[PDB]
Design a protein around this ligand. Structure first.
Ligand SMILES: OC[C@H]1O[C@H](O[C@H]2[C@H](O)[C@@H](O)[C@@H](O)O[C@@H]2CO)[C@H](O)[C@@H](O)[C@@H]1O
Ligand SMILES: OC[C@H]1O[C@H](O[C@H]2[C@H](O)[C@@H](O)[C@@H](O)O[C@@H]2CO)[C@H](O)[C@@H](O)[C@@H]1O
Lengths: 400, 401
């Protein structure tokens, strides 16, 4: 039983959860309804687990790519904004949260990765990926490095895999073809090979995660990182003098970040759907609501036109859109979950040297094209049996 | 590296692989066939991945519990010892390697864990798990600890989980029921809760593994360990003065270790099956072949009657068979691999506090009862996607720290 008469919200711990809680305090002040904001680890995996049993938050925030899966599983209420409200957000953001003809979440922000660089170490950022190895050689001679970014999560490596031709599912005639997958074509291989060579030549290390890359950039140890607007707040605190710019090209072609619309879905099992709609439409999705969240951790570009026109005066937000426009909106289909788990494993195995690039991407292509949602529960249960065993083994020397 | 006219053998690196290579040298001296003994890591996971392609070893040594899965997948040759040869080994050993009516490996040794204890630190060993926290409190004040053993491998914790009523698959009769799994009943929970409490109360550390427990016992730092007979020769080298005895009781009931029959299977893709039969029947399964292996690392109780009658005189082998009698022979059915992968994750997550005992054993029970051997390749493809992802994540987090 989710409890009637209050709202519980889950949102990722990289986002402005404290600013969201301030909107929640204002909602309580006007309405009497208490709002509790939590940021559980792995909430995008935890949500469908607790919500399947009718528990969990009233409202879940995540990028839109997970929501078609959640909707398919019956976890998300259809939302009911009137046309006047829908006119306040850009049309392409509503398209990202439309699944089988129904709106299933409220769009909040438009997220894309950018290249973030330290202006003191590197006054003119490289326009190409190909120039990064020579730059790293130069910087290593000064005890610095050229680039560090999260290698554990395929969101960050995808822009390079997609630049020369990689794609998730082929889009044609307004539909994604779940059986036409582009993770193992010549462009995907060229980009992942380029990444793997950076690692073979010691310009990057496979054991790099978000926290490692964030610390190296914010301590002035590495000249560049790849990250979204939520990261800007810790950089601002570090006082590194940084710029936010277009991602390097690869083979003369733009990097193509997958663009996520951070969105708020309402749990199908919540008895508080009308209060959740009120909080989202009349408190959060206002200039003052989004500003409260943004002042905590930047949202980047936002779906609300009136506030996006103010935010876009900042060239960091314009650069975020410049990168977004060069990439592709994520599909929200339920097969996105298999896509990301398969690509995450492929990047990991090629980066560690466990598999060659061609072996890794061939295995990911089969895993995705032969995936069948009928077996989702079985497949996920055994993935996690493997994940907790491998995590304990990876953490071991670290205890003993 | 399987080539016609030589033999490649895989055996685990804790066993007497150097001793086995001396048997291989004798075979090469008599027959001119070269024998190469290797001990790859994770060989029991590697074999089912590579045997069906260009393999793989000619002969694989492992406890019998993995071999039903290999045989069901077509990976092992039917072996053809005549009746006179079979009569030289104990019948219950041939039952452990019989799968759907066919013999699929040669039994070698009967393995059961025992309590190993340092007589200088504990002259009389405990017969209860319940006393171990009190013995640890006294030993901590002497700069030592009571018990250390490998907590990463569920083989070592299973005797305690099974003591009060945990079981893998209900036997009846004489069929294992794959739908009737006993990892999440009150007895399984009571055993695993006792282990988790030992860790919560700082009598053991969740991260202790084989080499940490072995170094502690053999350097005289901890009074007890739980291990099999292959461990005894490193202790002999240490001159800790040790004994080998019955595992402690829990709620007055015996610990029930799962008994493995270390067995030698012949790869179905071997073009040397006649040579492997000659090596195994005429060189290894003789007093002189088993003695050579045992002199390197003890096999424990052996399946070959002539040699076991001589070994049974050693009180360490009597303790091994006493523990084996109180425990159960593992099933060899294909679903045993699914059992161990699920219980490995459950013990690891409960020990480290990532899940409660109830949640950990509930997930193992679901994983085991929903596994379907027909879908093993789909299931294992995703298990390994998870394993490599979690390994990479943990290694990155170790670098952060
Ligand atoms: O790495 C795969 C992962 O990518 C995206 O998740 C992003 C997310 O969109 C952001 O809002 C942010 O905080 O970082 C996450 C990357 O680690 C997909 O949305 C997600 O489904 C996918 O697993
Ligand atoms: O821990 C589960 C593991 O248990 C048994 O493996 C034992 C094995 O029988 C011994 O010969 C020795 O190698 O130690 C192993 C424990 O680390 C099962 O035989 C095996 O299938 C299972 O995964």
């Amino acid at each position: 039983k989710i409890e009637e008469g209050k709202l519980v919200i889950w949102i990722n711990g990289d986002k402005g959860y404290n600013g969201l809680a301030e909107v929640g305090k204002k909602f309580e002040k006007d309405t009497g309804i208490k709002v509790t904001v939590e940021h559980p680890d792995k909430l995008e995996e935890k949500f469908p687990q607790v919500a399947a049993t009718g528990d969990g938050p009233d409202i879940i925030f995540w990028a839109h790519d997970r929501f078609g899966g959640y909707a398919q599983s019956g976890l998300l209420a259809e939302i009911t904004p009137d046309k006047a409200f829908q006119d306040k957000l850009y049309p392409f953001t509503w398209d990202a949260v439309r699944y089988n003809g129904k709106l299933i979440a409220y769009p909040i922000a438009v997220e894309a990765l950018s290249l973030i660089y330290n202006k003191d170490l590197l006054p003119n950022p490289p326009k190409t990926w190909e120039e990064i190895p020579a730059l790293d050689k130069e910087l290593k001679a000064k005890g610095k490095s050229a680039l560090m970014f999260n290698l554990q999560e395929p969101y960050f490596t995808w822009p390079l895999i997609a630049a020369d031709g990689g794609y998730a599912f082929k889009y044609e005639n307004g539909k994604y073809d779940i059986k036409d997958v582009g993770v193992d074509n010549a462009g995907a291989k060229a980009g992942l090979t380029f990444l793997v060579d950076l690692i073979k030549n010691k310009h990057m290390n496979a054991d790099t995660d978000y926290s490692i890359a964030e610390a190296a950039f914010n301590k002035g140890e590495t000249a560049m990182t790849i990250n979204g607007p939520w990261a800007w707040s810790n950089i601002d605190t570090s006082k590194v003098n940084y710029g936010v710019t277009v991602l390097p090209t690869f083979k003369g072609q733009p990097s193509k970040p997958f663009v996520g619309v951070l969105s708020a879905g309402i749990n199908a099992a919540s008895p508080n759907k009308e209060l959740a709609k009120e909080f989202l439409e009349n408190y959060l999705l206002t200039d003052e609501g989004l500003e409260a969240v943004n002042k905590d951790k930047p949202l980047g570009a936002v779906a609300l036109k009136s506030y996006e026109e103010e935010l876009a005066k900042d060239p960091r937000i314009a650069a975020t859109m410049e990168n977004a426009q060069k990439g592709e909106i994520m599909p929200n289909i339920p097969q996105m979950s298999a896509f990301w788990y398969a690509v995450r494993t492929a990047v990991i195995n090629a980066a560690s040297g466990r598999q060659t690039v061609d072996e890794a991407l061939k295995d990911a292509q089969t895993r995705i094209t032969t995936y069948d949602e009928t077996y989702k529960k079985l497949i996920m249960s055994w993935y996690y049996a493997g994940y907790y065993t491998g995590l304990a083994e990876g953490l071991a020397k670290s205890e003993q």
